[PDB]
Structures are given as C-alpha cells and as structure tokens.
C-alpha cells in the first residue's frame with residue numbers, strides 16, 4: 001500500500017478533496033466527498 | 043523545498059518567465075542621468091539563468 005496515484009511536467013502532492021458534486025465537502029470526507037489519492041494493490 | 047542554489051543612478055533591469063517547470067531570467071544594468079522614471083533610449087536584456095523547478099506561480103513580491 002506504499003504506492004499511490006491521484007499538465008506537462010506538473011507535480012502537486014496536495015490532499016485537497018475530489019468532490020463528486022457541488023457539495024460543501026470543505027476538504028473533509030463524506031458521501032460524494034473523497035480523498036484525492038488511491039493506493040496501488042501491488 | 044526540493045531545490046537550492048548559490049552563484050538611485052543604477053538602473054537595474056530584469057525579465058522573468060516560466061514554461062513547463064523551467065523558469066528563465068534575463069537582465070541588464072546601467073548608470074543614468076534622470077532617476078525618476080524609465081529613461082528614453084534602447085538596450086537589450088541578456089540571459090542569466092534557467093531553473094527546472096516545476097512550480098505553478100501566480101504572485102510575487104520585492105524584498106526591500
């Protein structure tokens with residue numbers, strides 16, 4: 001679980017949430033409000 | 043924090059621009075007669091540096 005995934009030569013390690021809708025997710029987890037990184041099952 | 047480096051009469055001039063994580067710097071220096079505002083004439087700035095840092099810039103400030 002140490003390995004993970006989320007422009008040309010862009011890099012950004014930000015924790016800012018994937019909103020799945022226009023919700024007040026406010027950077028906090030919930031239904032339609034998900035953390036930007038996912039782990040590779042290697 | 044992934045990178046670090048070390049190298050009124052003086053009109054000192056610079057240009058700064060950034061492209062796909064590269065960051066380019068050019069300059070010129072001259073003594074002048076009038077100090078108040080940009081004196082009429084012509085000269086070209088010449089390159090100094092390019093840094094491959096990757097940052098996504100939108101703002102800046104002078105360090106007085």
Ligand SMILES: *[C@@H]1O[C@H](CO)[C@@H](O[C@@H]2O[C@H](CO)[C@@H](O)[C@H](O)[C@H]2NC(C)=O)[C@H](O)[C@H]1NC(C)=O
Pocket residue numbers: 007008009010011062063096097098
């Ligand atoms: C600078 O920041 C912006 C976000 O403010 C980055 O935008 C992303 O660009 C990619 C293009 O491959 C899109 O797929 C993403 O959806 C964009 N993000 C968002 C939140 O819209 C941009 O890539 C950054 N540029 C650099 C060179 O780092």
